[PDB]
């Protein structure tokens, strides 16, 4: 077994670090695959970071892994950082790829290929879970906040890119000029799923409406993925495959 | 002794090999690797594909066969100290699996959000594909299968039955590799847009979700760690 | 570099690029190179390709080795997707600024919303200098000049690092104590209610309140600075002005067209009727980025890519001048190594063995006529 | 079918069957039918247009209820690279066959239930 | 026009259909236009009498490989042969397993205790032979059908 | 009463109404008022709006305070 109390503590600490590595990087791989194949195109390009589609889609598809990892970590260890660790791992993988491949392999500027910020939403989700340990309360209030705070959290980053520019007779934002100048051979402009205006777009409501829709759908997706993570935690021994 | 320096090798081998792979693809991405019908493409990326597939098959066969042949027959007469050492070795295997999963499913996958988004595909064997699906995926599949086999053949907790969370964690991410068929079919036919979030990607996603079974796998390994040498100290 | 893999018949019948010109073949960093030409949208647009209702004038290149300074269809700038009409001919102009040193194969391409990339002829353009010398200045309507290479980079890095640090601080705060196995045992064996106690709840409340307050304050500060912002400008642009070409005075009827399998030549029999009032002669056959020239009639001087140019690849059985009103039938053979290099011979693999192209007819004075031909392409094996 | 059955009997694992045997079931379909349909793919010069023998069969033998456009067949795309149409379709079919086999194993498990629903 | 075509609303087109008689009788022949998303548009129909015997009908065609075949029976023998061969292989597999008792004794053996007795060598050897022979025959048949008919579209 | 909220550029480039006329400005119950004019469909029709392949000539009003007796495009009902 173990020699003494001290050696047990040291063994537990070593296990803690190794299992933290395993959790963090398996989450990085799986969450990054899910994110980049469910929100990657908006996350890739500043001229894709719009007010309708980016704000709508990103929190909805990104609340998935935080819900499951929360439902496991909080329930089994009272560790209230499942959402934070998921978001940090996604950001780390995204930034590594942006710097070494988007800017390293290809030579797209970082101010063009930067990822979105998600830590505020993750922190809200984690704190709202730890306080008032109710998973239902988390799914309703914390997911609401996660959806709502996405665009305001990223506004300090993308606001300078929205300064209007008179570009060769046409009005363009700085992000628009970035997308125009830095040629993406595989990504023509029409692929861009961004706000284009509708006849039923009343007043200045595009960003808040998208944020509230994303918050509601985030509630729904969090509710689903809490139980998905509950299943993924199963310790069953399927006798034969 | 307990946890030994096999963990350092587990990290370093993947780090060094994938850094060299990244250097190789940085050197031969353009300039023998843009035109899939050029003769230099055959010598620098098709040969890479052939060699890597053969080496992956050989390495998987050898590693899995050795792990299964050296399986512990007398698991009953295993001391708690030896069980703790084997649990640490299995944790090293899981660390290697996590590192390989990162390299495969994050780095080289999004590295494509960087290759195609920039070039016009020329084939189902983009040099990067010759890196992601035919390396960043078989390598982590081999590591996951090896970790599962080691758990089953050395840990009494993971013996006497197939653990469902471990099986999911090991096989689901494997299903991403045959899912490449859906990727190809739904790139050439369905969807000519380079949309990364196209439904032709819900195939790595669905099976990327199965990696969440690492949570059940890890609580199982925690219980296996805390069998005889659980303490005391912990809960005392 | 992405063609030679697409279907031969689809490359033949989507868009015909001609009158292509390049301002320079070798450039310095920050120097501008302009690509001009015309493209004609083929009438027999394949049903598998969506109609070019939404199309984008793109550049085929290995990443931003050039930056697209300007692009025009007709005479007007087209930074967004545009609508093209089948059967119309448009003139285009793309202005590129060199950014990365090296030898780059630059293609002019048209991306169609539901059909994918239509790659035109590519030309090798040499860039010399250093990437560090590249500048992309732009002046905003707020009266400030910024360099797009590094503008907002510091702010982006700062905010991302700040939020990452906040998350790492949260995780480390909870990670100072033992993490996995003792906490799992405490939760399992009896009620836990001991690993989360004040001031842990106070720290979490502080984290939540600080996160919300910092987000609000940062948004307000980013609104006070940059008080003038506009949304992303998007939307397909209609009313592209096509070229008003004169009606051709030459009518050509294709009476069968064959190619040998295997081979590097394509043979077709044409009935050419000369209207107007000048003797014409067949000078060129363009099928898919490949120009087969009758050197005795016409010579290329626009610096067309050599691997796509067949200087004497067009052989006409009787290419004597065709008097006005006269109709004759000739055997036309287009033969060049390009026919196999660019896999135009692989139309045998295609599910639609039909070709399309452009015939260029030249008279004595030098003025030229463009006529379009399309017919089934029948392989011959014996 | 033979591949699916033998891969199940050997290595009785249903998971192994769903992964390997279904892969083989999807992959061997087109090569298994090639000896039958290959003679029908001989090219024919038919009234100025290139047509396969199967194409001429469909043209000649009139199906009043089945016009040609209903035919969901390969028509070519701008993203069809080289000679890959058949293998790509075969591999996609094999992967989807793995998925469908996995689903229908449990569907058949349910359909085998010997329960006595006391009242309907 | 052996394939689908595009028509323009408001335009007038002239058409010509050539039919070869195949089956005797009195047939109401309509010229019709099928539209992708609207269904059949049937034109006027005319009674056309066909006399003779169906056995006299021929549908010759000459391929680009220089052979003349009759579309009425071309490849019929090959299709029948291959289908019968594969059906026979499957029936042989089933009968091999069906020589022994099938349902109730095997069910009882599986239920009452571990079975591990109804599938024993050389049953595994026979199954391995079946699998290997199936794969090898498929590969050989594909190669043979590629050597013959080397030109296909 | 439903405009002033739609996007300015979409109101500018969809349909231009001109030569508008109203037969009467004040009417009795059961009395008829006729609205005439011309509208031009803009060539630069926004891509976010579907092409007017299916369009209906409607009246903007707060419920059936009037009944639409007739409506014509060209000269036909
Ligand atoms: C603490 C309690 C008191 C505060 C109560 C707040 C009431 C609403 C404030 C509106 C702000 C404003 O100004 O209107 C709305 C502003 C735009 O404004 P505008 O451009 O002027 O719109 C012009 C038209 N108007 C003059 C009539 C406003 O954005 C929006 O369209 C927001 C739309 C959100 C829709 C989804 C909401 C879902 C709620 C779910 C609840 C669980
Ligand atoms: C638990 C609830 C937490 C809520 C935290 C809110 C922080 C403050 C946000 C100010 C937004 C702003 O300034 O106005 C709205 C703007 C969009 O404006 P825009 O017209 O598209 O123009 C964009 C250019 N700007 C910025 C120069 C004008 O931003 C948003 O899209 C945020 C929408 C969600 C608001 C959530 C608060 C409403 C109540 C929520 C509870 C039911
Ligand atoms: C049960 C839920 C109760 C929540 C009560 C609401 C708290 C609001 C806090 C202040 C937010 C703010 O002031 O900012 C919200 C901004 C306003 O944006 P704006 O007007 O376009 O421009 C910026 C103008 N500023 C700079 C003056 C703010 O974003 C939005 O458009 C979202 C507004 C919709 C809110 C819908 C709430 C519905 C509640 C229903 C209860 C029965
Ligand atoms: C899970 C089991 C995985 C099995 C697959 C492993 C794939 C290995 C690479 C395939 C190469 C190929 O196929 O190409 C063969 C290449 C082609 O380059 P060259 O033209 O000869 O140029 C000269 C070679 N340079 C360009 C590399 C300088 O040359 C070689 O011989 C060199 C291959 C070296 C691989 C071993 C080093 C890896 C980093 C160190 C830490 C491990
Ligand atoms: C038992 C349940 C299994 C069923 C699955 C079988 C595969 C379906 C094959 C569709 C063929 C068809 O039906 O038609 C084919 C249609 C015809 O369209 P087109 O006119 O050529 O459009 C031209 C547009 N191109 C040029 C881009 C093709 O192409 C399609 O739109 C393909 C639709 C995608 C269906 C596949 C989704 C797979 C889900 C994967 C998520 C994990
Ligand atoms: C025993 C181990 C060693 C053998 C390893 C085999 C490596 C690949 C061989 C390619 C043959 C060839 O020739 O390329 C591919 C041939 C066509 O060839 P092409 O027309 O010349 O293509 C021109 C372009 N090129 C020159 C770059 C090849 O078909 C295909 O597109 C097949 C595409 C399959 C996609 C889905 C695969 C899913 C795999 C799932 C795994 C669990
Ligand atoms: C357990 C795995 C069993 C695999 C059994 C394979 C038997 C041999 C098949 C030869 C095919 C051929 O000849 O090439 C490919 C051709 C299609 O060619 P095409 O270009 O469309 O032209 C058609 C006209 N032909 C025939 C005159 C050229 O056939 C196929 O569509 C088969 C595609 C699936 C191949 C599976 C093998 C690859 C590895 C599988 C494991 C990951
Ligand atoms: C874990 C899975 C391991 C499987 C290894 C591959 C075994 C291949 C057996 C020979 C097949 C053959 O030779 O035939 C396959 C044919 C080739 O067709 P072709 O090149 O177009 O023309 C015919 C040319 N011939 C006549 C010379 C053959 O069909 C295909 O296109 C399918 C090729 C894609 C294979 C993808 C394998 C990916 C493995 C990834 C491992 C990490
Ligand atoms: C009817 C729905 C209205 C909203 C109420 C939903 C909350 C229900 C959550 C629940 O089931 O109870 C879990 C904890 C129990 O802790 P207690 O030991 O009851 O603590 C009571 C003292 N306290 C007021 C500081 C909390 O109690 C809490 O969850 C926290 C209670 C304080 C409310 C504010 C917490 C949420 C902060 C965003
Ligand atoms: C994409 C969807 C996510 C996959 C999750 C589905 C898992 C379904 C559960 C399952 O596999 O059941 C196993 C049974 C075989 O049972 P046994 O082997 O008798 O095990 C006894 C205990 N047990 C009955 C509770 C399992 O049924 C069997 O016949 C064995 C099949 C086991 C396959 C499960 C592996 C899934 C990997 C993708
Ligand atoms: C180039 C390929 C080299 C792979 C080398 C494989 C090493 C052999 C695997 C192995 O059995 O164990 C190696 C180490 C230490 O564990 P061991 O104790 O040696 O394993 C047996 C346990 N037993 C002694 C009690 C019977 O266990 C480990 O943690 C080794 C991890 C290696 C990382 C995985 C590399 C796989 C790359 C495809
Ligand atoms: C490709 C997709 C995989 C499908 C998933 C099915 C496998 C999942 C369950 C599993 O791994 O169990 C098989 C054994 C574990 O022991 P058991 O299943 O109890 O049976 C041991 C006897 N047996 C080795 C013949 C199977 O594990 C082993 O013995 C594996 C080591 C022996 C294989 C080495 C040869 C392979 C070379 C390529
Ligand atoms: C880690 C994944 C790698 C692949 C291994 C997956 C196979 C697992 C299947 C399984 O759970 O075990 C069932 C049988 C058990 O039979 P055993 O009594 O263990 O027979 C051992 C002697 N043998 C090598 C001839 C089989 O053992 C077998 O299923 C057959 C084992 C021989 C492998 C080749 C069989 C498949 C032929 C296509
Ligand atoms: C298309 C979907 C496939 C259909 C499969 C669905 C079957 C659902 C199972 C079911 O029918 O449950 C029966 C119960 C009534 O229970 P009881 O009649 O009390 O039987 C006692 C034992 N039992 C509760 C386990 C049934 O619930 C009831 O109220 C009786 C309804 C029974 C209807 C089942 C017949 C299905 C034929 C299509
Ligand atoms: C946790 C993942 C780390 C990925 C780092 C990476 O991709 O490195 C390649 C990149 C390549 O850029 P550079 O360092 O300038 O060297 C260029 C060499 N090539 C072109 C072959 C990559 O930078 C490095 O090699 C830094 C070493 C980091 C060690 C963890
Ligand atoms: C879980 C959500 C899945 C929604 C599917 C989707 O977004 O499909 C879009 C696509 C619409 O095609 P579109 O986006 O217009 O594609 C444009 C590019 N082409 C024409 C080449 C495909 O619809 C389909 O073809 C059916 C998808 C079936 C999903 C099981
Ligand atoms: C759509 C979410 C369904 C999640 C399945 C969980 C099943 C748990 C059974 C123990
Ligand atoms: Cu090129
Ligand atoms: Cu044309
Ligand atoms: Cu009004
Ligand atoms: Cu107008």
TrEMBL record, chain B:
Residues that bind Cu(2+) 1: 112, 116, 129
Q: What is its EC number?
A: 1.14.13.25
Kindly list the positions annotated as binding Cu(2+) 3.
183, 201
Its keywords, alphabetically, are:
Membrane, Metal-binding, Monooxygenase, Oxidoreductase, Transmembrane, Transmembrane helix, Zinc
Is Electron transport one of the keywords UniProt gives this record?
A: no
Please list every transmembrane segment annotated in the UniProt record, as residue ranges: 6-24, 44-67, 88-109, 129-151, 163-182, 202-223
Instruction: Identify the stretch annotated as signal peptide in this record.
Output: none
Chain residues that bind Zn(2+) 1: 112, 116, 129
Protein name per UniProt: Ammonia monooxygenase/methane monooxygenase, subunit C family protein
Q: Source species, please?
A: Methylococcus capsulatus (strain ATCC 33009 / NCIMB 11132 / Bath)
Instruction: Tell me what gene encodes this.
Output: pmoC1
